[PDB]
Amino acid sequence: RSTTLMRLPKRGMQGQVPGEIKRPRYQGVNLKDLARFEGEVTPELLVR
Amino acid sequence: RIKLLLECTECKRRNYATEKNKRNTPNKLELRKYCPWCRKHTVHREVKI
Amino acid sequence: MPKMKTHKGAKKRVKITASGKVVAMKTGKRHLNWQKSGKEIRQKGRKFVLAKPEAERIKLLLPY
RNA sequence: GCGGGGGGAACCUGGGGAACUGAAACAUCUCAGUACCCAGAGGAGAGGAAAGAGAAAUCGACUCCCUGAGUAGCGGCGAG
RNA sequence: CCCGUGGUUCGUGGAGCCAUGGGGGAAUCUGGGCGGACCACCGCCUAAGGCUAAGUACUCCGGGUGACCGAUAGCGCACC
RNA sequence: CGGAGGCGUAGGGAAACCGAGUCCGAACAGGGCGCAAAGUCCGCGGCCGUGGACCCGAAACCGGGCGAGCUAGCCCUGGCC
RNA sequence: UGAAAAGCUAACCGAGCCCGGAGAUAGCUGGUUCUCCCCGAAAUGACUUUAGGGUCAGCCUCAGGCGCUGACUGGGGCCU
RNA sequence: AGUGAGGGCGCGAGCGAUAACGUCCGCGUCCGAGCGCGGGAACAACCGAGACCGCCAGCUAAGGCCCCCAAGUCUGGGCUA
RNA sequence: GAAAUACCACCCUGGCGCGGCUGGGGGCCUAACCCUCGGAUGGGGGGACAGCGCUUGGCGGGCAGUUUGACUGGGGCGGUCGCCUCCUAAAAGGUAACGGAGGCGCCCAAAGGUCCCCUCAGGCGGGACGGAAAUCCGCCGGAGAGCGCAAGGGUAGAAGGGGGCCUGACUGCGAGGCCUGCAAGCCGAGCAGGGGCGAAAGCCGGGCCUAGUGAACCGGUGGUCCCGUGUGGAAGGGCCA
Numbered sequence A: 001r002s003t004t005l006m007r008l009p010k011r012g013m014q015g016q017v018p019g020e021i022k023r024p025r026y027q028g029v030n031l032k033d034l035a036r037f038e039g040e041v042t043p044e045l046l047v048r
Numbered sequence B: 001r002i003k004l005l006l007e008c009t010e011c012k013r014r015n016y017a018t019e020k021n022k023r024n025t026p027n028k029l030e031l032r033k034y035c036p037w038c039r040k041h042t043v044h045r046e047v048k049i
Numbered sequence C: 001m002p003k004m005k006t007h008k009g010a011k012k013r014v015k016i017t018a019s020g021k022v023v024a025m026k027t028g029k030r031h032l033n034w035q036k037s038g039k040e041i042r043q044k045g046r047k048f049v050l051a052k053p054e055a056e057r058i059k060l061l062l063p064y
Numbered sequence D: 001g002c003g004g005g006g007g008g009a010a011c012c013u014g015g016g017g018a019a020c021u022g023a024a025a026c027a028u029c030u031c032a033g034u035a036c037c038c039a040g041a042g043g044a045g046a047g048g049a050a051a052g053a054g055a056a057a058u059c060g061a062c063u064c065c066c067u068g069a070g071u072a073g074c075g076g077c078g079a080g
Numbered sequence E: 001c002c003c004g005u006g007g008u009u010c011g012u013g014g015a016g017c018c019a020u021g022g023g024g025g026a027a028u029c030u031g032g033g034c035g036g037a038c039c040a041c042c043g044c045c046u047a048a049g050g051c052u053a054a055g056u057a058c059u060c061c062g063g064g065u066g067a068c069c070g071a072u073a074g075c076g077c078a079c080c
Numbered sequence F: 001c002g003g004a005g006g007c008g009u010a011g012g013g014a015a016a017c018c019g020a021g022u023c024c025g026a027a028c029a030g031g032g033c034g035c036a037a038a039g040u041c042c043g044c045g046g047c048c049g050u051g052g053a054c055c056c057g058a059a060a061c062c063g064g065g066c067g068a069g070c071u072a073g074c075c076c077u078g079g080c081c
Numbered sequence G: 001u002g003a004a005a006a007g008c009u010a011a012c013c014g015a016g017c018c019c020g021g022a023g024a025u026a027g028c029u030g031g032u033u034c035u036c037c038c039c040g041a042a043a044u045g046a047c048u049u050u051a052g053g054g055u056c057a058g059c060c061u062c063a064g065g066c067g068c069u070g071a072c073u074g075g076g077g078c079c080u
Numbered sequence H: 001a002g003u004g005a006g007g008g009c010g011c012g013a014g015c016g017a018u019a020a021c022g023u024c025c026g027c028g029u030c031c032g033a034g035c036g037c038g039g040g041a042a043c044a045a046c047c048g049a050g051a052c053c054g055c056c057a058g059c060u061a062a063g064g065c066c067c068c069c070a071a072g073u074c075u076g077g078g079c080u081a
Numbered sequence I: 001g002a003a004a005u006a007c008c009a010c011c012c013u014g015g016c017g018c019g020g021c022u023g024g025g026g027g028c029c030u031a032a033c034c035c036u037c038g039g040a041u042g043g044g045g046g047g048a049c050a051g052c053g054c055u056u057g058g059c060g061g062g063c064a065g066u067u068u069g070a071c072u073g074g075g076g077c078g079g080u081c082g083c084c085u086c087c088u089a090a091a092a093g094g095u096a097a098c099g100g101a102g103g104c105g106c107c108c109a110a111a112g113g114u115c116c117c118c119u120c121a122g123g124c125g126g127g128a129c130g131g132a133a134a135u136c137c138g139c140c141g142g143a144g145a146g147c148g149c150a151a152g153g154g155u156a157g158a159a160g161g162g163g164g165c166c167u168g169a170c171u172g173c174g175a176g177g178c179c180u181g182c183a184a185g186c187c188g189a190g191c192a193g194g195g196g197c198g199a200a201a202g203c204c205g206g207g208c209c210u211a212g213u214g215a216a217c218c219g220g221u222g223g224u225c226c227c228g229u230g231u232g233g234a235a236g237g238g239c240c241a
Helices: A024-030 C005-009 C055-060
Strands: B003-013 B018-025 B032-034 B044-046 C015-017 C022-026
Touching: B003 B032, C005 C055
Parallel strands: none
Antiparallel strands: B003 B018, B003 B044, B032 B044, C015 C022
16 A cells, blocks of 8 residues: 555665764663774674 | 647756646747756747747 | 564664663655755655564564 | 386475465565475485686685574565 | 477576577687676686485384283284 | 674654654644553463464375387288188 | 267276375364463555455563653643 | 434324324333233233242232133112113 | 750659569479389379478367356345445544445546635516526625535635636655555645745645545656676666656
């Protein structure tokens, strides 16, 4: 019951611009190092 | 198909607006008016088959 | 073993906010006939009907 | 002077290959390359060193397990 | 490479690669298919021969274990 | 003990993306929010989806075989009226 | 096959019999099992190749929270 | 989670012949699904009445009291025969 | 004269010249192929045909596999199946019935805007071409004539009759409500851009309103200028109209 406007065509290989929601709040509230953390150091980080 | 055929308005190459219309009485005669999103309002014209 | 949404559904609009809801193009009428015209064409935001949109939901649950 | 042939519960490769039921009808579709007829190598064959992957100036035989998403997608884009 | 078809998550599609039934019909490493229908790029691999081990399958047959069965359940079949 | 993962951990959009903001948009007007009000895992259990899924129940369709001492036919060959 | 009615085709072939898909399919009928305790359904709506079926609406039950909000009654507007 | 069809009675319109234990809709009750007791002879839905279980207890509905069967063959005043 | 004439330029028409492309058809062979010979691997008849391989278009029950609706005081044949209006809905609203009735599946380019004016049929009385009924005069009138189209509502304190000027029958949108379980369909102040009718107090996001209507898929066109399966583009494709 309804046309549509979302079409995901004949394929399988998309690009990227990595949208991982991370929070300066978890960070500074209590799990960080106020200057250098980097994606690399975020394991524990609940944003990966 | 009856004296009722559907046309629509387009404006001086800077847009096109729509709406149906007819055929009967003054047939073709088709300037009209209307305003596109071109500029802020603007003539438009109409015609367009 | 895994069910997986009326993929179809997920596809044909059919969208969810993990909050607890979904929507489809207003889809009230539009993008079809319409020797309609204007003001009428005012209906293309988005929409959602409650109650019913459960089946939708659990069919989907797993991805979309 | 050799060889085969003849078997064999199931597994196995290729050969050829179907309606139901679903799609609450049903003709694309579906079950499916599934059931079954066959030929044949085994003790297991199958595949097995890349005109591959994949895009990072990267990997590196083939096979099987977990994951890869049931997403990427295939479609009277419907059952599936 | 033209159409006639198989594969493949592809059911006809902008639909690629391998694969063949018809007609055409060649290149030796400036070679030639492959990433993007296709065109200009870079990149990739080296095709149209050959051999086999090892890790998943299978259960005739043997051994063993069973919040698996007791004679109308268990294999139907515990014994000419 | 094995730490490829999948679920959380903002999301808003067809996307480009932006980002707790956001798409429409030239519109300061609405809808997805923001709002954590943490889930995530193990179990036990009401419960669907696929699998025959309370149980036995049909006309029949399809595959491979089984039979002319079944029966009718036709062939060969004696006999009897 | 068939001096053909739809005949006979291992004792009832209008499309044989055994095994197989398969435990086909079955909105239709049957059948649907210890005790006791609470509540208490509807047997109507809406569109449906549905119409003895079904999706959503109406009524029910168990759990959270609101917690004086309810049928009905008094009274006073403004509706028939 | 279950019914997705049901009937009866009263009133109000259809219809039908203003016929039917007909069928259409609505207000109510109903009966199923409790509606198992009284009851009217006995009778799912007509008047009474809600049965958690006892009583060799008493008051009552409806509707009853010559008898068959609990209860005045009461009293009072008539009118039919 | 519409043109001017030599001799040198290019370019055409041509019914005929010639040349490259290719379409149509008529003749014994011949060696593949077929039948072949008649007692031999050599002869004979046919032979570029049709046999035959593949692709082409078309006849085509002979065959196959499906389907050929629901309602309805049985089935079928008959009716009928979407929407508006009136009755019965019994006075809120709101409900069957093979219950009564009766319309629509158009359009109106200007019946779409606004400013300015006007104001019925019909009764009567008097009148040229009349002449039951035009056209004009004279009175009278809960407005019963009127409003494309059916009914019903409304309603000339006109939505109705006439003139002027004009496009909003605008995009962006809407708060908050009608009804409805679904989706529907429907009502709308006000903010923005932008105009149009008056000088303006303001009306205009189609009509006087209740019927002229159709999901979803699929695909088209006018965008856009979002995506592109290494990158540039592109087949192709996402949202708008």
